[PDB]
């Protein structure tokens, strides 16, 4: 209810816009998790369909010896680091670690952790837990490459957020933070 007026929420075809900025080919573009099947499918999807010759993993592990093999055999050096993407200071080192010929032109969150549970057994460290690799560390990224040269900021939400699923609460949550997040930046004219 805004302003008298009720309103409901609900999901309308969209027909894509070919608006958006194009992507540099030489330059390195940030995927979260990307030792993970989505960061690994977002990565090859990314050095077939784009053309990126230049990658970076932000994982826990921060290894990936197959996925990093074929971006070496398709001909993209990536640069992989052993980092969670909610920690600050890790974080700050790996995004220093890019190579100053190569800056950052695109960045693409796919980090996600998934403790469901039911609001009776819901407690706020499951809460912590879920936002801080996808909600905290998508922050992280906006107020770190805020001046860098951004095309895309890719946040892997969920339908959990939106549609809503039972026993994924703070799932749900992290989702439409993540939703709000994006939201804010696009405001900005920033790219989300």
Known sequence: VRNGVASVPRLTRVTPRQDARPLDPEGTVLITG?????????????????????LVLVSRRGEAPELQEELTALG???????????DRAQLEAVLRAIP?????????????????GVVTELTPDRLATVRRP???????????TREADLA????????????????????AAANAELDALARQR????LPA
């Open 152 to 171: 895309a900021f890719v946040l892997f939400s969920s339908a959990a957020g939106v549609l809503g699923n039972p026993g994924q609460a703070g799932y």
């Open 186 to 189: 696009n405001s900005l004219d």
């Open 134 to 144: 996808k909600v905290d560390a998508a922050r992280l990224l906006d107020e770190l």
């Open 76 to 86: 993209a050096s990536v640069a992989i680091a052993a980092c969670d993407v909610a």
């Open 34 to 54: 990307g030792t993970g099947t989505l960061g690994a499918l977002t990565a090859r999807h990314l050095v077939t369909a784009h053309g990126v010759r230049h």
């Open 100 to 116: 100053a010929e190569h800056p950052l032109t695109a960045v693409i969150h796919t980090a996600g952790v998934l403790d469901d």
